[PDB]
Structure formats: structure tokens, C-alpha cells
Amino acid sequence: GRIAFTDADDVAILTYVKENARSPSSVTGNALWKAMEKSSLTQHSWQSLKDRYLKHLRG
Secondary structure (H helix, E strand, O other): OOOOOOHHHHHHHHHHHHHOOOOOOOOOOOHHHHHHHHOOOOOOOOHHHHHHHHHHOOO
């Protein structure tokens, strides 16, 4: 299982990815995601973070 996401995670992951991830680099690699794992507003990893994005958010 890849953890779970709630309504707060959607607002935290979005507000964060929309503020920094705005080019073909922060969302293509694993920097903006791993960087959040070191100092994120909520409690989550970077894998499920970037995985849920391409899973059914950006595309």
C-alpha cells in the first residue's frame, strides 16, 4: 500500500507543487519532492507525493 491522502494533503501538496513546481524540472526529477520530505508542512514522503501526481493529478 502507498499510504493514503486526505483533503489536507491535496491542499498542501498542491499549494507546494504549484508554488515551486512550475517547470520541466521540479516535477520531472525528485528534488522538489525529496526537499519537501525534509521540511514538509504535513507528514508524508516524497515517493507517494510524486507518484500520486503522475498517477491522476497533472495528467
